[PDB]
Amino acid sequence: VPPSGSVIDDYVRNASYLEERLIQMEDATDQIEVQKNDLEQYRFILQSGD
């Protein structure tokens, strides 16, 4: 087991960074897809103009 420096806190830091980095980036698809679906539904609705 080669000695490992005190960069354990650096690991803590970058993990605590990546957590929100990925949370904020992932929590968007759930919305962006439903907005797409709603707009597309509105489009077919309007397709019956006659």
Determine the Cα–Cα distance for residues 3 and 6; give it in Å rounded to an integer: 10
Q: Is 43 exposed, middle or buried (0-12, 13-18, 19+ CB in 10 A)?
A: exposed
Determine the Cα–Cα distance for residues 42 and 17; give it in Å rounded to an integer: 40
> Count residues contacting another protein (CB under 8 A)?
24
According to CB under 8 A, which residues from 11 to 30 bind another protein?
13, 24-26, 28-29
From the list 2, 9, 15, 20, which residue makes contact with another protein (rule: CB under 8 A)?
Answer: 9
Amino acid found at 35: Q
Q: Does 45 bind another protein (CB under 8 A)?
A: yes
Binding site for another protein (CB under 8 A): 6, 9-10, 13, 24-26, 28-29, 31-33, 35-36, 39-43, 45-47, 49-50
